[PDB]
Design a protein around this ligand. Sequence first.
Ligand SMILES: Nc1nc(=O)c2ncn([C@@H]3O[C@@H]4COP(=O)(O)O[C@H]5[C@@H](O)[C@H](n6cnc7c(N)ncnc76)O[C@@H]5COP(=O)(O)O[C@@H]3[C@@H]4O)c2[nH]1
Ligand SMILES: [Zn+2]
Length: 360
Amino acid sequence: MGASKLRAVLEKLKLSRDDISTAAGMVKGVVDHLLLRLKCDSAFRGVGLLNTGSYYEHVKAPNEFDVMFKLEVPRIQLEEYSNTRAYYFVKFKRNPKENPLSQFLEGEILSASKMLSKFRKIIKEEINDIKDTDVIMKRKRGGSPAVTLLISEKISVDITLALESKSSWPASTQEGLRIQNWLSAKVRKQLRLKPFYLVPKHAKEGNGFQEETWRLSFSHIEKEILNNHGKSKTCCENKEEKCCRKDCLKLMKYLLEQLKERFKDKKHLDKFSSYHVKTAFFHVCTQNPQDSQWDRKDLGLCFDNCVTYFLQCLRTEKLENYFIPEFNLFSSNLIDKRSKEFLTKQIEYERNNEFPVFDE
Ligand SMILES: Nc1nc(=O)c2ncn([C@@H]3O[C@@H]4COP(=O)(O)O[C@H]5[C@@H](O)[C@H](n6cnc7c(N)ncnc76)O[C@@H]5COP(=O)(O)O[C@@H]3[C@@H]4O)c2[nH]1
Ligand SMILES: [Zn+2]
């Protein structure tokens, strides 16, 4: 695929500032309401919106949003669950006083499900009485840490509770975030000085879930490297330094979206998500650390790079969490071989036919 061809695909996907800002305005209204309602509970007194510029997650298009509600909690003490590397039990270093989160304490262990339940119940209670905006809560999605809302039958919002820890990141992330040769060792240090988050997504335990466990999240870091993405500090600030990194990611996401859409009737692509694509993309960024390897005229080659890497990940059934290297997002235990073989074949068909998926 030629570079100009690929950018013509993105150009026709570009949304009008009006349709975007209207969409953003609706979710902000709902979010503002939920935040203040939430503050009426002592346990969520500390809730606040984490890292949101309210830019949508779908390319097409401005109908889906992903928000995290960060909760500042006292010094946290983690205990890794069954060496899963990403899931943890949360305990408090000092709990002699009857904590505000004490109601969610099952033993010395802060229950993810109990918090998630109340969080959800509080939100569901304010959804009936929202002024001027029609809002509905979606069914619980299997295994999701998120409360999903649908605004005006058009806009989906994922609202995810997020415990904030200012402690240093857990050992499982020691070899993660390999950005040294790309964004530099000192950027990695400064990033790792920032807080990490815990969302109420439970580890698998037999036919069910270990309902107390939380999972690590670094969406704030993911946000930072996407918007400050070059080896050069002035990457994408002038004509002579315009790179195609953001375009590649968009095209990879739109490819996955379109395929998921085409084959909704089948079940094969249901477990794949833009998070897989974003992760695959970060790895490619690490493999191609130079801004010259992401030249604007090379969008064609760079996109194929991303496609090819993603394909290798599907075939070998290995896609490392960018922050937690021993967590395999593509293990056969999460996504079975057939689904990955199906996605593999469709992407390959697309590439061999000049991406019919990319035209209207
Ligand atoms: N809004 C939202 N924020 C999250 O952090 C998150 N984590 C999971 N989910 C959704 O819960 C359900 C259970 O999926 P699972 O955990 O088994 O696999 C997930 C998970 O391993 C990984 N993943 C997705 N988002 C994140 C994330 N923010 N951080 C780490 N991993 C993530 O990508 C897989 C599929 O993602 P989605 O299919 O788009 O949404 C999942 C899914 O609907 C999330 N939904
Ligand atoms: Zn750039």
